[PDB]
Design an enzyme around this catalytic site. Structure first.
Site, PDB file in Angstrom:
ATOM      1  N   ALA A  30      34.054 -58.932 -41.816  1.00  0.00           N
ATOM      2  CA  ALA A  30      32.690 -58.847 -42.282  1.00  0.00           C
ATOM      3  C   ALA A  30      32.032 -60.224 -42.306  1.00  0.00           C
ATOM      4  O   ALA A  30      32.695 -61.265 -42.172  1.00  0.00           O
ATOM      5  CB  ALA A  30      32.646 -58.197 -43.667  1.00  0.00           C
ATOM      6  N   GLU A  95      24.090 -71.339 -42.305  1.00  0.00           N
ATOM      7  CA  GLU A  95      22.915 -71.175 -43.126  1.00  0.00           C
ATOM      8  C   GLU A  95      22.715 -69.661 -43.168  1.00  0.00           C
ATOM      9  O   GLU A  95      23.142 -68.918 -42.256  1.00  0.00           O
ATOM     10  CB  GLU A  95      21.698 -71.859 -42.495  1.00  0.00           C
ATOM     11  CG  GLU A  95      21.198 -71.206 -41.193  1.00  0.00           C
ATOM     12  CD  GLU A  95      19.952 -71.893 -40.667  1.00  0.00           C
ATOM     13  OE1 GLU A  95      19.937 -72.297 -39.488  1.00  0.00           O
ATOM     14  OE2 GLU A  95      18.988 -72.032 -41.446  1.00  0.00           O
ATOM     15  N   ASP A 140      25.097 -63.947 -24.409  1.00  0.00           N
ATOM     16  CA  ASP A 140      24.953 -62.702 -25.167  1.00  0.00           C
ATOM     17  C   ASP A 140      23.597 -62.675 -25.896  1.00  0.00           C
ATOM     18  O   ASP A 140      23.504 -62.352 -27.096  1.00  0.00           O
ATOM     19  CB  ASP A 140      26.124 -62.528 -26.161  1.00  0.00           C
ATOM     20  CG  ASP A 140      26.332 -61.072 -26.583  1.00  0.00           C
ATOM     21  OD1 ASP A 140      25.801 -60.144 -25.905  1.00  0.00           O
ATOM     22  OD2 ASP A 140      27.035 -60.846 -27.598  1.00  0.00           O
TER      23      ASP A 140
HETATM   24  N1  LIG Z   1      23.986 -66.779 -40.345  1.00  0.00           N
HETATM   25  C1  LIG Z   1      23.836 -65.491 -40.588  1.00  0.00           C
HETATM   26  N2  LIG Z   1      22.961 -65.068 -41.587  1.00  0.00           N
HETATM   27  C2  LIG Z   1      22.810 -63.750 -41.829  1.00  0.00           C
HETATM   28  N3  LIG Z   1      23.435 -62.734 -41.192  1.00  0.00           N
HETATM   29  C3  LIG Z   1      24.315 -63.199 -40.187  1.00  0.00           C
HETATM   30  C4  LIG Z   1      24.563 -64.499 -39.832  1.00  0.00           C
HETATM   31  N4  LIG Z   1      25.482 -64.598 -38.805  1.00  0.00           N
HETATM   32  C5  LIG Z   1      25.765 -63.367 -38.568  1.00  0.00           C
HETATM   33  N5  LIG Z   1      25.086 -62.438 -39.379  1.00  0.00           N
HETATM   34  C6  LIG Z   1      25.154 -60.944 -39.410  1.00  0.00           C
HETATM   35  O1  LIG Z   1      26.553 -60.581 -39.133  1.00  0.00           O
HETATM   36  C7  LIG Z   1      26.583 -59.725 -37.954  1.00  0.00           C
HETATM   37  C8  LIG Z   1      26.934 -60.706 -36.920  1.00  0.00           C
HETATM   38  O2  LIG Z   1      27.501 -61.549 -36.198  1.00  0.00           O
HETATM   39  P1  LIG Z   1      28.028 -61.916 -34.921  1.00  0.00           P
HETATM   40  O3  LIG Z   1      26.822 -61.534 -34.185  1.00  0.00           O
HETATM   41  O4  LIG Z   1      28.239 -63.170 -35.560  1.00  0.00           O
HETATM   42  O5  LIG Z   1      29.190 -60.908 -34.893  1.00  0.00           O
HETATM   43  P2  LIG Z   1      30.298 -60.648 -33.684  1.00  0.00           P
HETATM   44  O6  LIG Z   1      31.267 -61.396 -34.391  1.00  0.00           O
HETATM   45  O7  LIG Z   1      29.566 -61.184 -32.548  1.00  0.00           O
HETATM   46  O8  LIG Z   1      30.148 -59.133 -33.992  1.00  0.00           O
HETATM   47  P3  LIG Z   1      29.343 -57.990 -33.245  1.00  0.00           P
HETATM   48  O9  LIG Z   1      29.961 -58.044 -31.917  1.00  0.00           O
HETATM   49  O10 LIG Z   1      29.493 -56.707 -33.963  1.00  0.00           O
HETATM   50  O11 LIG Z   1      27.930 -58.389 -33.193  1.00  0.00           O
HETATM   51  C9  LIG Z   1      25.279 -59.629 -37.274  1.00  0.00           C
HETATM   52  O12 LIG Z   1      24.919 -58.384 -36.711  1.00  0.00           O
HETATM   53  C10 LIG Z   1      24.293 -60.231 -38.315  1.00  0.00           C
HETATM   54  O13 LIG Z   1      23.565 -59.170 -38.873  1.00  0.00           O
HETATM   55 MG   LIG Z   2      29.873 -61.946 -30.412  1.00  0.00          MG
HETATM   56 MG   LIG Z   3      26.848 -60.325 -32.158  1.00  0.00          MG
END
Ligand SMILES: Nc1ncnc2c1ncn2[C@@H]1O[C@H](COP(=O)(O)OP(=O)(O)OP(=O)(O)O)[C@@H](O)[C@H]1O
Ligand SMILES: [Mg+2]
Ligand SMILES: [Mg+2]
Ligand SMILES: [Ca+2]
Length: 309
Positions: A30, A95, A140
């Site tokens: 998460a 952040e 991406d």
């Molecule tokens: N700095 C941040 N502030 C607020 N919400 C964030 C932040 N970084 C990530 N998130 C939330 O956490 C979830 C995202 O991250 P990321 O895009 O980092 O995930 P992944 O590890 O790429 O996962 P997924 O493939 O499901 O997107 C996102 O959909 C976003 O809503």
């Molecule tokens: Mg990713």
């Molecule tokens: Mg993502």
């Protein structure tokens, strides 16, 4: 371990952060809203576990993402605040952003206003031109990876699939947003930062129509479709000529005919004068709506109000 000594802070994250609340779910765990106890400031924490049996690969992915994040110094990229270690879990701190552009599409169940798309597009573009000037490629770009932060800045997040060098040749990205020349590596071929300009064009359509073209087709078939068919375009003729033109330029299928992100910074769609509070108003507009979505206590969008708890 050399990598832990070099990339991580030694503090116990459990002592530094509190009031953790899940605001998303990634590929390693998460993502949480949290408060840094040292200054009562809200942050975002991406917990990435590397236990289980895929431990080696998981650890490798974590370090690679951390090394990329610490290189970034641009206002339109998500700010990295460091990482901590604790029981087979790396805590990557960033952040805090109140939501993604896709969360905005989900909350209103409506496309954004053209002026809002222009503001979001402009922020993401500046971030991309920054990465490209350093030979990096995001790979991406999509609404779900574009974040909004108070007061109102738009930032590129999720560097999990980024490349530290161009040209690159990896089949990576999310199918519906992938550039044709990246898909053509499914077999073999190379590409550069222009694949992000294509993804940005698809993202522009996604913000204008709530979904990228081909979203109604299974991923594998979509890939062949993108590689073989002519480029998609904004569906409606009501958008301004500048917007339609920006998207059509972004979606040129022949890479050499597609402009670099640097050139697009001066495109009229992005430079057209708009209120300096477009994003702030959007955020407020969204907060107001989240408070109205029935079942605010069972909302997946209620996070946009977490810092008010
Ligand atoms: N700095 C941040 N502030 C607020 N919400 C964030 C932040 N970084 C990530 N998130 C939330 O956490 C979830 C995202 O991250 P990321 O895009 O980092 O995930 P992944 O590890 O790429 O996962 P997924 O493939 O499901 O997107 C996102 O959909 C976003 O809503
Ligand atoms: Mg990713
Ligand atoms: Mg993502
Ligand atoms: Ca390679």
């Amino acid at each position: 371990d050399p990598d832990v000594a070099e990339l991580f802070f030694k503090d116990d994250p459990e002592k530094l952060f509190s009031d953790l609340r899940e605001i998303g779910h990634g590929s390693f765990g998460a993502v949480y809203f949290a408060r840094d106890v040292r200054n009562s400031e809200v942050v975002a924490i991406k917990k990435m576990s590397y236990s289980g049996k895929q431990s080696n690969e998981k650890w490798q992915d974590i370090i690679k993402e951390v090394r990329f994040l610490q290189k970034l110094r641009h206002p339109n990229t998500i700010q990295y605040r460091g990482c901590y270690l604790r029981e087979h879990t790396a805590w990557l701190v960033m952040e805090y952003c109140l939501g993604s552009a896709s969360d905005l599409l989900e909350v209103h169940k409506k496309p954004l206003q053209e002026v809002e798309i222009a503001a979001v597009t402009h922020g993401a573009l500046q971030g991309l031109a920054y990465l490209h000037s350093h030979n990096m490629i995001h790979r991406d770009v999509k609404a779900g990876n574009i974040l909004l932060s108070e007061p109102g800045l738009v930032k590129l997040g999720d560097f999990g699939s980024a490349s530290i060098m161009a040209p690159a040749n990896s089949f990576v990205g999310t199918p519906y947003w992938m550039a044709p020349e990246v898909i053509l590596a499914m077999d073999e071929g190379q590409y550069d930062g222009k694949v992000d300009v294509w993804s940005l064009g698809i993202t522009c359509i996604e913000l204008a129509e709530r979904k990228p073209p081909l979203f109604n087709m299974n991923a594998m078939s979509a890939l062949y479709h993108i590689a073989q068919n002519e480029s998609p375009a904004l569906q409606s003729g009501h958008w301004s000529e500048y917007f339609r033109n920006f998207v059509d330029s972004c979606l040129q299928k022949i890479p050499q005919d597609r402009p670099t992100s640097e050139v697009l910074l001066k495109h009229r769609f992005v430079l057209r004068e708009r209120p300096p509070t477009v994003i702030m108003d959007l955020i407020q507009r969204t907060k107001d709506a989240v408070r109205e979505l029935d079942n605010l206590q069972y909302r997946k969008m209620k996070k946009i109000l977490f810092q008010e708890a």
